[PDB]
Symmetry: C3
Subunit: 259 residues, 3 copies
């Protein structure tokens, strides 16, 4: 409502925009509460197939945790606020639907952490990223130390976290931190395109694929293969799987319904 905007104008896709432009879309407690509420609702939306997360304006995706607010917090409040940010990251990652981060500007600290909590990332050429925490004598406390090395390797994650340096979208692409980079005015269009492609695939299968990958990658390969085996059981008794084969037989585009 106040700190976040939601857009359901695109069939099967929901667009969440951080809306605190004056504060560089930083994560305030109020914003986190609104975002948690929205994520709770989306979690139960069977008709929602893909989520896009972005920031309002052309300067910032998310500048991170709100420092004005952090500056006025005692130790107890700091702990509560960091807990609220961590929990929100978990809610984004555990959504049944794929979540696409559309990085429209600066994504620093908590902002990079937020993008890491998404399934994958698309950035504007003008975007900049970084985990700047060590420059302030703190560390990434919302998964930055964990999600970054998992995505891009320990070496790169270490140099980035130890230096706290800011990097360009192109550098981010080279390192594997962002999967796609596109001109600034084409960001929303490319995110919607990718989302619609995902939305055209079997919704039950896409959800099972997210679970299989996200959970299986956390363990040994042998166990991960067994999780994938159980996940696949989930598409066997679906009408969509039958439509896939029928469309193959009829030589046409399949049309899935999530059943």
């Amino acid at each position: 409502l106040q700190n976040i905007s939601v857009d359901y104008a695109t069939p099967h896709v929901v667009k969440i925009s951080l809306n605190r432009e004056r504060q560089a879309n930083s994560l305030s407690l109020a914003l986190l509460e609104e975002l948690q509420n929205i994520l709770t609702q989306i979690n139960e939306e069977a008709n929602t197939r893909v989520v896009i997360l972005t920031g309002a304006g052309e300067k910032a995706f998310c500048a991170g945790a709100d420092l004005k607010e952090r500056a006025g917090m005692n130790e107890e409040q700091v702990r509560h606020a960091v807990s609220m940010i961590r929990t929100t990251m978990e809610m984004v990652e555990q959504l049944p639907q794929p979540v696409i981060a559309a990085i429209n500007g600066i994504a620093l600290g908590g902002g990079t952490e937020l993008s890491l909590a998404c399934d994958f990332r698309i950035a504007a050429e003008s975007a900049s990223l970084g985990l700047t925490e060590t420059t302030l004598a703190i560390i990434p406390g919302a998964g930055g130390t964990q999600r970054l090395p998992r995505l891009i390797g320990v070496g790169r994650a270490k140099e980035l976290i130890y230096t706290g340096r800011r990097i360009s979208a192109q550098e981010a692409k080279e390192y594997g931190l962002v999967e796609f980079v596109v001109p600034v005015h084409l960001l929303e269009e490319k995110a919607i395109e990718i989302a619609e492609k995902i939305a055209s695939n079997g919704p039950i299968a896409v959800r099972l694929a997210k679970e299989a990958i996200s959970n299986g990658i956390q363990v040994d390969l042998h166990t991960g293969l067994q999780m994938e085996k159980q996940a696949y059981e989930g598409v066997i008794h679906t009408k969509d799987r039958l439509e896939g084969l029928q469309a193959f037989k009829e030589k046409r585009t399949p049309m899935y319904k999530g059943e």
Copy 2:
């Protein structure tokens, strides 16, 4: 053998070719049966040091599961078929010898899964890859959800699996999915020359390296180091190690014998 070809022309190297060109080298249950039988034989071949896996023709490495055969299968049939494919992948992965995928054309779904079960991959410039399963309302059921993120990272694996999009050999190389790209007319000689190099190295050492890397990467670094330590004990008392030392001292090529 009617669905595959096995060639031992090159010393210490065996080349297995999927041989169903008319069917884009798709994986029928009959082909999977033959492949499992040859994999069982190679598993016990001490004279065989490296294996090359490829497809017949210049259009397809492997189009994946045979959908003509899959159509209309009842529940029990589907489970058995997916089981046959996943078991075959495990057998490729667990061969003592290194296995090189020579991707001569399209490698889709089960075809990309088959290439992921190999130690590393060489692709024709004209090859295309992808895990197209979600476009059929299913998920990769033969390790694609597990081996792909392990090789190229979770972010890229997710965008590929969720979209089910096809990518060029060039794109695959950029993402780290294939290790080499060469012209299709040179694919066979490139795979043979890399296989010959590996075959000239100490076979006990190469086999132990495969075991140490493949198993060690599944666990924590500390335990992984202890596994390497035990593996190293397997080479220090060998006659091949002594030949390596003498060859280096005499500045001549070593002639390893697997002892």
Copy 3:
């Protein structure tokens, strides 16, 4: 003395392997002093970053000393091998980040030494490889473990099975080295990066190293719990307050490890 130790800039110690005639190879003597220096640095508050390099323009470290090994049976190979392994563990477990400045060839133990460092910066003319299988052995100081963790299983397998040596440029492509610079600029770029790290909160950098190094070894959920505990280590620090104050005042923070 087979190694030199000097403060290149405030808080940045440069350790140079100094056995140029023997390609900066790892002899027992060098290993002993390297272990001694690392034992000392573990207890230091002044040192915030370590740069590890080799003397000359030809070799970073050629690995295990060949002349010293020439006169070794299976039994002597173990103690030597054990000391190399142990040294690798001391580098990765050191509180401070360690940057490998690869000034030339890195082979066997030398490549393994670079992998035990937090990150690597290489001269344009440097090269790296694990040629062990060409000699019918395997990497015995973590190469089979640290390499796939950094660059993925597929490329680690290709390089280890073939035993091929690669250029700094190839290494950069694979993510084996994080930075590549012209030969004459290796020292100054390693120092520049170390200075940036040394200007950040020392408690925070140290906790970041532990959280990353340990957390990456387990499942994400547990790793996140480790990060949570590590964050508790910065919350009550004066440096954290200085960071917020220096940022507000828009001036350089003066951290004191408190």
